[model samples]
Target: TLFVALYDYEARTEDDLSFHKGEKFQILNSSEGDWWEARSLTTGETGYIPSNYVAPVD
Candidate 1:
């Protein structure tokens, strides 16, 4: 999801980051627009990302 791809680091570019379909992101907080606070499990870091890209781990 967005958090998994964005948190812990940068996306190189906003367009460069893509969702892996079956990945889960650790959400940190709720925000408006395309910037939702989140973190990465792989890297163990936190940041903001697009809300549209985030989804409940499914």
Candidate 2:
């Protein structure tokens, strides 16, 4: 699914990806508990991010 970053977030680990507000991400894995794996549309970087920080984009 496609989603938009709701706010800016800095990566704390190598498995996390940093993103800014309004950025678009493609969800790769959402089975994990609070965090979801997503790939950035701009950077093509895939990593985990807080599920609550993104919203589904139409």
Candidate 3:
């Protein structure tokens, strides 16, 4: 599934994903708390994104 980003996040580390507000991406893994692993639609790269920062796609 996918989610829409709510904030423009500048990646703090190599594992974090950088995305603009409202960008949609695929969720590769979301079993953990707070953080969800997401795959970028634009870059086709996967990285970390906080759960609160995105809303599930309706």
Candidate 4:
């Protein structure tokens, strides 16, 4: 699962801000270099996030 948070602009880093831990997000797309594109149920916006920040739901 993924979690999306609100911020000034597009989040450049996961360390910038954090959403509710264990929150869920809809996976959009992703590439190499820890690059990921996704959408949030909490915030209906699309943005890029580091793949390293994404955690798998066990």
Which candidate comes out best when scored by TM-score?
Answer: 2
- Predicted structure 3, TM vs. truth: 0.86
lDDT top scorer: 2
C-alpha local distance difference test of each model: 0.52, 0.92, 0.87, 0.53
- Model 1 per-residue lDDT tens digits across residues 1-58: 3333323324555433334434456776675556665655655545566666655653
| Deviating ranges (above 4 Å) for candidate 3 | none
Off-target runs (Cα >4 Å) in candidate 1 are 1-23, 31-34
| Candidate 2 lDDT tens digits, 1-58 | 6999999999998999999999899898887778989999989999999999999998
Off by over 4 Å in 2: none
Q: By lDDT, rank the candidates, best first.
A: 2, 3, 4, 1
Candidate 1 has a TM-score of: 0.50
Candidate 2 overall lDDT versus native: 0.92
Between prediction 2 and prediction 4, the one with superior lDDT is 2
Q: Which window of 10 residues has the lowest lDDT sum in candidate 1?
A: 1-10
- Superposition-based RMSD of candidate 4 using all C-alpha atoms, in angstroms: 5.7
Query: What's model 4's lDDT at 3?
Result: 44
For candidate 3, lDDT tens digit of each residue in 1-58? Answer: 6899999999899888889898899988788767888888877878999888999889
TM-score of each: 0.50, 0.92, 0.86, 0.52
Candidate 1 has which clashing residue pairs, if any?
34-50
Give, for candidate 3, the lowest lDDT window spanning 10 residues: 27-36
